[PDB]
């Protein structure tokens, strides 16, 4: 119900995996973002919670060259800091 307009960098990540809209739901932002890491195979193949994005656009949005998906606050900081809520 609550819609978001993602900022230029976060939008290029969602759009680079096949998403064509500009206003998203939180479910869609999390789907397309998780699909971006899977398509780009950014996850550590053995412990798939670790995400390497040092030479990736995701790293600019994140701040660090790597993160663990278990760090929810850190992931939600990048998500809401790079979107406009309506």
């Amino acid at each position: 119900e609550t819609l978001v307009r993602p900022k230029p960098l976060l939008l290029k990540l969602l759009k680079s995996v096949g998403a064509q809209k500009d206003t998203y739901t939180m479910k869609e932002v999390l789907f397309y973002l998780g699909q971006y890491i899977m398509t780009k195979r950014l996850y550590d193949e053995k412990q798939q919670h670790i995400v390497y994005c040092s030479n990736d656009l995701l790293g600019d949005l994140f701040g660090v060259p790597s993160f663990s998906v278990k760090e929810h606050r850190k992931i939600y900081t990048m998500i809401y800091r790079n979107l406009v809520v309506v």
Binding site: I37, Y43, Q48, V69, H72
Partner: peptide, 12 residues
């Protein structure tokens, strides 16, 4: 992918 299960713990 075991990645996807980890990532689903983000939402709702």
């Amino acid at each position: 992918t075991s990645f996807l299960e980890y990532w689903r713990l983000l939402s709702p």
